[PDB]
């Protein structure tokens, strides 16, 4: 039902497995998953935009923007691009 | 009504315009239509857009309606004349009178070139004018009154990766126009119903912050591999 | 009318879910579940405000608006040991890297 | 001075006629030009005489040609330097200096139509031949309707050369721009948006033959004029609306993908200026043109479906605009669009789930709710053109049924209404909406064709009814204040309706295709309704398309009508015969009608004619030796070829032949030859002479079986020769007998060759004619409009074989698909 990422610092994220399987990688992949290269502060804004996915898939009204600040915006398109997603 | 360098420029002669520039011709004056000799090099060829440029021409003169020599070089598609201005600091998000950019006036037409050099020069895709229509929004009505060919089809595919994400949905409806046609229709129900893949907002995102600069040499200095880096250049 | 949590507490986070009218009781279920804590010994803080069990989540400072998909809303976890309740730690996010210059504002 | 100046007219005046020899011998051709043309006093008649001499057009004399070209341009130049603008000296010029520019712009136009070839062959003069063609330019730009008429001339004539010969065009390359700028920017208004047709076909003829030399030149020129009104510079509603003619009226010349770049790019700029420019008064007017363009080249949207459907959806949308001329200029272009794109709304296209043409009958109800009755009358032909597109027989009747159902159901209500009270049909609105319905009938039967027999048939019995009806009401209010009240807008009304049923009626059957069916179902009633109310009418009041239906129903049931040919006759034929011979402008409908039906019933149902009672039938032959013996050109010649076609199949019956020459073959032959010697009917010469050398024949090979001599037998031979000699002496008593007797066994002996026969009778009559101070051309007419005739046949199969001259809407050659 739940499923547990660990980020490269030691931060543990845990996500229900249906969210974590939105990324091709995981579902390749996978009750817990490690990752040597993806800092927390990343890693955060991944599971956070899994539950966006998710909630906005095929949606009938406007899906709000998802927020990424520049600091975070290349790691967190190099993650993308590790992940599937 | 218009005045010596005007007719050269308009008559697409290098040797004319460089010539009467040699003596001290007022590069910047305007003519009775409120347009400069740039409006109408850009209009017509690039080597007169070059000669005007190297002698002190303006690349943001505004003329009756606020447009730039870049709005006109983008609606005739003259690449080349699109990339000069740019190269020489031309505003690639400028605004007339009615909010209308020069990627707009190129969508609107559906123009791939010109589109492909203002994006790679940091053209605003999110941008919307006063009347609510927006670059993609105008290439969909090109596309739904089936005037467009791949040329169309390859431009729209560019705006729907520089944007990351849009809406062509008021309310919960798509426009009339849209709604008629069951396969476009289709199609764009379901591109605007998807979130949108973490990579695009995340390269949307980088590019944003690289703002009004040669992407491509930009991303050049860059950390990310180089499959990342053609991706940040919507290559792919 | 749903409201979405992060859970946190070192260095372990929850993501979830739940209406806005469920009682914290409902969450420390949760908790539970996930973690294998009886709800005797777990203790929720909003912004280092301890929360008690009765009250219903939507009339605690979390809103539909408020905490959304993509910008949950933090709930420290607090967990009893040794018949005493240990002090409310969350450890920070990794801080970013220096933005490069190219991508500074000009 | 004066006497001078009337010595020159003199000249001019007699120049045609002078040998050339005083004229281009002499010292003439310079003393014009080194004594008068420079002097203002003598300068006009003086070009003007040159220009005569360029219009000479002999063989020889090249020298002489090229030595007063030379000169005269030299004058010219001296005179009038290049430099100067033609257009303001003469807007703001005195007559004579208007008048010179005219006879300069003549002298040019001649000249070069003439001999440019003779002029361009010499490489000295290159330069001043170009100099020639500048000042063609210069006057080009006079906004007066005669020079340009004259200049437009040269200019089509060199642009048909150029393109004739595929060389010579590099002779003319680096100008042939210039007129191409000329053709856009004074392009004349179309007639579809006398001296204004000619002067459109002439320059459309002209950009055409230009852009066959150049299509990449015409569509940077109409491009950069486009962008030009789009971004704001010489943007102006006339500018546009020529820019838009000059870009409809190329449709054809291009070849298939040129021409869907082209129009794809023009569109989009139209399309972008409409979005820009704000007011109900710009928009409409950029609505007007691209209706227009869009009207032209149905290719185009033929092989673009989505466009076709938007365009389609469009002029649906603009069929609501209240603004003025809009809704007319809808409903044409969308007829002219279903005509040329019929096959592609009955058919399933791709992306599609039904055909285009469901979808148009199920919102019928909506979209014509603001359109005028005309406008709604054609939106149903167009309708039915798509309609009759459909070849599946089961399908085509389901559309058939729906395509009709309001009309139907406003018919079936009105019916009903008068079923309960006739007196219903004496209501002003309850007559204009039968007749609007019997118009939507006849615009739609016109558009379907046979097929329409399932909604005729439903509506055929109550319509009679309803004919008889509004008859009774006419006769009764002629009855009762007399033959003025057919003033009345009442009376008229109905009687739009009696002549939209007879329309409706005439326009089916023309195009049936089964006349068992028709004589079985349809003829009788409609006898029945339409014949005695004719005959008891009064002549203000019978309607003339009775006699035209008759006609048309003779002319495809044949002998299956041959039994009711003696009553139309007994309803008709005295009462239209009283009518029309009385005077020759009272009833012109009526007389053509007659003549028509009376020709129809000869060549189809000759028996009916024996079972016609004897007086009938010498009311017959009265009538048409009264059409034969007319003054007009029109009635003369029906008369004749009734009276040929009618010996001819007189020849045919043995039992009647007989009867038939001994009671009219002189009576005939009488009034033939009288016609012929009075010269009133020379156009029909010919005619006489296929008539007269058939009589003469009989005769000859003794089939008339018997003695025309009322008293005594005698060889009919001898005695038709004695008859016509003693006719030809009373027409012309001074002739001598032995030159009557000669060329009367002439004419005799002749009768075998039309040709000769012909020749013989020309001869004497021409003979006849000199012998007096009578003038013979008028004789020779019959050959003159023929060769006339040619020139226009060889002009138009010349102009087939050059794509985009001809209006893709006039060429009756529709493609396929
Ligand atoms: C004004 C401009 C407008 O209403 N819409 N602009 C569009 C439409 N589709 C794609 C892109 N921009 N305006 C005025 N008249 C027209 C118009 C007329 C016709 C005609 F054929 F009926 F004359 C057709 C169309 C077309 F292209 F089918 F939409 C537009 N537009």
Request: hydrophobic share 40%; charged share 20%; aromatic share 8%.
């Amino acid at each position: 039902m739940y499923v547990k990422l660990i980020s490269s610092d030691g931060h543990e994220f845990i996500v229900k497995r249906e969210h974590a399987l939105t990324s091709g990688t995981i579902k390749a992949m996978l009750n817990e998953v490690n990752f040597r290269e993806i800092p927390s502060h990343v890693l955060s804004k991944v599971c956070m935009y899994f539950t966006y996915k998710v909630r906005y898939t095929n949606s009938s009204t406007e899906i709000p923007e998802f927020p990424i600040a520049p600091e975070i915006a290349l790691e967190l398109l190099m993650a993308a691009n590790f992940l599937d997603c | 009504t218009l005045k010596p360098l005007h007719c050269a420029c308009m008559v697409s002669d290098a040797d004319c315009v460089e010539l009467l520039l040699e003596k001290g011709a007022e590069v910047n004056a305007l003519d009775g239509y409120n347009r400069t000799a740039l409006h109408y090099a850009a209009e017509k060829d690039e080597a007169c857009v070059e000669v005007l440029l190297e002698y002190g021409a303006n690349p943001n003169a505004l003329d009756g309606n606020r447009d730039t020599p870049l709005h006109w070089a983008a609606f005739k598609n003259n690449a080349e004349c699109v990339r000069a201005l740019l190269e020489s600091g031309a505003s690639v998000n400028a605004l007339d009178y009615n909010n209308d950019t020069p990627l707009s006036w190129a969508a609107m037409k559906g123009n791939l070139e010109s589109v492909s050099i203002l994006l790679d020069y940091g053209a605003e895709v999110r941008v919307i004018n006063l009347i609510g229509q927006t670059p993609i929004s105008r290439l969909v009505a090109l596309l739904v009154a089936g005037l467009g060919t791949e040329k169309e089809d390859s431009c729209f595919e560019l705006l729907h990766r520089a944007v990351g994400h849009f809406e062509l949905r008021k309310n919960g409806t798509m426009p009339r126009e849209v709604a008629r046609d069951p396969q476009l229709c289709e199609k764009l129900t379901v591109l605007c119903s998807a979130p949108g893949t973490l990579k695009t907002l995340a390269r949307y995102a980088v590019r944003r912050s690289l703002g009004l600069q040669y992407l491509p040499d930009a991303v050049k200095g860059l950390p990310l591999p180089a499959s990342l880096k053609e991706y940040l250049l919507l290559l792919e | 009318m749903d409201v979405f949590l992060m859970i946190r507490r070192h260095k372990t986070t929850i993501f979830t879910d739940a209406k806005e009218s469920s009682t914290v009781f409902e969450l420390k279920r949760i908790v539970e579940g996930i973690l294998k804590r009886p709800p005797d010994e777990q203790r929720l803080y909003k912004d280092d405000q301890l929360l008690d069990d009765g009250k219903t989540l939507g009339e605690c400072g979390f809103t539909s608006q408020t905490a959304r998909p993509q910008a949950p809303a933090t709930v420290g976890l607090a967990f009893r040991a040794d018949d005493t309740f240990e002090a409310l730690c969350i450890e920070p996010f990794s801080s970013p890297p220096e933005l490069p210059d190219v991508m500074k504002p000009q | 001075a004066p006497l001078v100046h009337a010595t020159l007219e003199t000249l001019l005046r007699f120049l045609n006629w002078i040998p050339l020899g005083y004229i281009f011998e002499t010292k003439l051709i310079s003393t014009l030009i080194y004594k008068f043309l420079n002097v203002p006093m003598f300068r006009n008649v003086s070009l003007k005489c040159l220009t005569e001499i360029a219009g000479v057009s002999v063989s020889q004399y090249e020298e002489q040609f090229v030595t007063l070209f030379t000169l005269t341009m030299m004058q010219l130049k001296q005179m009038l330097p290049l430099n100067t603008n033609i257009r303001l000296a003469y807007s703001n010029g005195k007559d004579d200096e208007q008048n010179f520019i005219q006879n300069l712009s003549l002298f040019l136009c001649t000249f070069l139509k003439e001999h440019d070839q003779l002029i361009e062959k010499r490489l000295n003069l290159r330069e001043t031949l170009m100099e020639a063609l500048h000042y063609m330019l210069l006057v080009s730009e006079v906004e007066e309707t005669e020079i340009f008429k004259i200049c437009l001339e040269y200019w089509n004539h060199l642009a048909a050369e150029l393109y004739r010969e595929s060389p010579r065009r590099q002779l003319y390359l680096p100008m042939l721009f210039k007129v191409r700028l000329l053709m856009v920017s004074r392009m004349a208004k179309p007639e579809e948006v006398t001296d204004s047709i000619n002067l459109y076909k002439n320059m459309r003829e002209t950009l055409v033959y230009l852009t066959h030399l150049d299509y990449v030149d015409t569509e940077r020129i109409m491009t950069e004029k486009l962008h030009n009104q789009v971004n704001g510079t010489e943007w102006s509603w006339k500018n546009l609306n020529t820019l838009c003619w000059a870009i409809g009226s190329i449709s054809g010349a291009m070849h298939e993908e040129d021409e869907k770049r082209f129009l794809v790019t023009v569109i989009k700029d139209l399309l972008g200026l409409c979005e820009q420019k704000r007011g109900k008064d710009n928009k409409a007017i950029i609505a007007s043109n691209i209706m227009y363009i869009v009207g032209q080249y149905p290719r185009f949207l033929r092989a673009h479906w989505k466009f076709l459907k938007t365009v389609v959806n469009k002029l649906f949308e603009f069929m609501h605009e209240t603004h003025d001329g809009v809704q007319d200029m809808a409903c044409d272009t969308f007829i002219k669009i279903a005509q040329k794109c019929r096959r592609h709304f009955v058919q399933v296209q791709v992306g599609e789930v039904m055909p285009f043409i469901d979808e148009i009958l199920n919102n019928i109800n909506t979209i014509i709710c603001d359109l005028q009755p005309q406008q709604v009358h054609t939106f149903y032909e167009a309708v039915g053109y798509m309609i009759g597109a459909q070849t599946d027989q089961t399908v085509q009747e389901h559309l058939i049924e729906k395509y009709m159902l309001l009309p139907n159901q406003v018919w079936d209500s009105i019916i009903q209404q008068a079923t309960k009270n006739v007196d219903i049909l004496k209501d002003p609105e309850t007559v204009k909406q039968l007749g609007s319905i019997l118009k939507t009938n006849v615009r739609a039967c016109k558009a379907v064709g046979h097929p329409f027999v399932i909604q005729l048939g439903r509506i055929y019995l109550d319509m009679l009814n309803v004919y008889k009806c509004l008859s009774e009401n006419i006769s009764a209010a002629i009855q009762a204040n007399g033959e003025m009240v057919t003033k009345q807008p009442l009376i008229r009304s109905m009687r739009t309706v009696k002549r939209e049923t007879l329309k409706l009626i005439s326009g089916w059957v023309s195009r049936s295709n089964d006349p068992q069916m028709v004589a079985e179902n349809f003829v009788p009633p409609l006898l029945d309704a339409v014949l005695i109310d004719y005959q008891r009418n009064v002549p203000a009041a019978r309607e003339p398309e009775v006699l035209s239906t008759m006609a048309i129903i003779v002319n495809k049931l044949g002998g299956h009508i041959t039994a009711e040919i003696p009553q139309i006759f007994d309803a008709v034929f005295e009462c239209t015969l009283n009518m029309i011979n009385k005077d020759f402008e009272e009833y012109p409908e009526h007389r053509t009608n007659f003549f028509l039906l009376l020709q129809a019933v000869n060549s189809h149902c000759f028996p009916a004619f024996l079972a016609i009672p004897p007086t009938q039938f010498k009311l017959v032959l009265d009538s048409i030796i009264w059409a034969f013996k007319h003054t007009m050109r029109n009635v003369a010649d029906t008369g004749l070829q009734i009276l040929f076609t009618l010996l001819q199949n007189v020849a045919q019956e043995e039992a009647a032949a007989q009867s038939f020459y001994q009671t009219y073959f002189c009576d005939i032959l009488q009034h033939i030859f009288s016609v012929v010697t009075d010269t009133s009917h020379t156009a029909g010469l010919t005619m006489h002479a296929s008539i007269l050398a058939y009589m003469f024949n009989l005769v000859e090979e003794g089939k008339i079986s018997t003695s025309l001599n009322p008293g005594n037998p005698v060889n009919n031979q001898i005695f038709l020769q004695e008859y016509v000699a003693n006719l030809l002496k009373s027409a012309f008593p001074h002739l001598q007998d032995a030159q009557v007797k000669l060329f009367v066994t002439g004419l005799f002996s002749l009768n075998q060759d039309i040709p000769a026969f012909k020749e013989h009778l020309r001869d004497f009559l021409v003979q006849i004619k000199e012998f007096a101070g009578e003038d013979t051309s008028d004789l020779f007419l019959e050959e003159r409009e023929i060769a006339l005739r040619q020139a226009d046949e060889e002009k138009h199969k010349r102009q087939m074989s050059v794509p985009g001259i001809f209006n893709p809407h006039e060429i009756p050659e529709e493609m396929c698909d």
